[PDB]
Amino acid sequence: LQALSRVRFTTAEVDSAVARISQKIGVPASYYQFLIPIENFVVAGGFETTVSGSFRGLGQFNRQTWDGLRRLGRNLPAFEEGSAQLNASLYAIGFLYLENKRAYEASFKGRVFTHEIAYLYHNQGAPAAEQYLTSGRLVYPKQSEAAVAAVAAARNQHVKESWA
Ligand SMILES: NCCc1ccc(S(=O)(=O)F)cc1
């Protein structure tokens, strides 16, 4: 029962594409495996993803974030087309991870960009993510309980020097 237009992908086709794309662009497959179930609806034979409204596809991108990646030179279709597609959305998730990793490491020198921190950056955007890490307050607080748990864990990991 889920706590309260779609496209459906099978687990196999998502897995195959993740395996291929993650290898090609140097983003861990485990990050995709972490993020996809948080952002989308898990069903028996795969995942369903919302492709209407402001946030769309497996990465739940908005147009501004998607276009930000294109501005960096990433080869993506237009937001409205790519966000409904398997491969383009997976590339975008990964490209965004790579850019957010750079942003995190530049502001918090000597710190490690973990999956939950990467998800926080994905969820809030890099500016607001850094603001949450410093202030403890989300700029965009209207998130799911799973998203909130993930970003809380992210801040915990950020602050603490080591596993413990
Ligand atoms: N996942 C992106 C998080 C995000 C990024 C930007 C905004 S907005 O201020 O431009 F409406 C809102 C939410």
In angstroms, the CA 105 to CA 132 distance is 15
State the Cα torsion 49-155-100-9 to the nearest 10°: -20
Q: Ligand 1: distance of its center to the CA of 96 in Å?
A: 14
The protein residue with its alpha carbon nearest to ligand 1, atom 5, reads 125
Q: Ligand 1: distance of its center to the CA of 7 in Å?
A: 23
Q: How many whole angstroms from its chain centre is CA 139?
A: 17
- β-pairing, 46-50 with 41-43? antiparallel
Domains of the chain: total: 1
Closest by Cα among 92, 84, 94, 122 to 30: 94
- 22, 94 in Cβ contact below 8 A? yes
Encoded tokens for 55: 């946030």
Peptide-bond breaks in the chain following residues (C–N over 2.5 A): 4
The length of the chain in residues reads 164
Q: Ligand 1: distance of its center to the CA of 84 in Å?
A: 19
Look at the block and give the residue holding tokens 């769309």: 56
- 24, 94 in Cβ contact below 8 A? no
- CATH code where residue 9 lies: 1.10.530.50
Q: Which atom of ligand 1 is nearest to the CA of 64?
A: 10
The alpha helices in the chain, defined as continuous H runs, are: 11-25, 29-39, 63-71, 79-82, 86-107, 115-124, 126-135, 145-159
Which residues have any ligand 1 atom within 6 Å of their CB? Answer: 62, 64-65, 123-125, 140
Look at the block and give the residue holding tokens 């028996």: 44
In angstroms, the CA 32 to CA 89 distance is 11
Method: X-ray
Dihedrals phi, psi of 82, to nearest 5 degrees: -65, -35
Q: Which atom of ligand 1 is nearest to the CA of 54?
A: 11
Helix (H, G, I), strand (E, B) or coil at 6: strand
Closest by Cα among 84, 108, 107, 88 to 96: 88
Closest by Cα among 17, 49, 54, 43 to 32: 17
Residue 129 is part of which domain span?
A: 1-164
- 28, 119 in Cβ contact below 8 A? no
Look at the block and give the residue holding tokens 């497959």: 29
Probe residue for ligand 1, chosen from 58, 122, 140, 143 as the CB with the greatest number of ligand atoms within 8 Å: 140
User: Which resolution, in Å, applies to this structure?
Assistant: 1.4
Q: How far apart are the first and last CA of the chain?
A: 34
Q: Ligand 1: distance of its center to the CA of 61 in Å?
A: 9
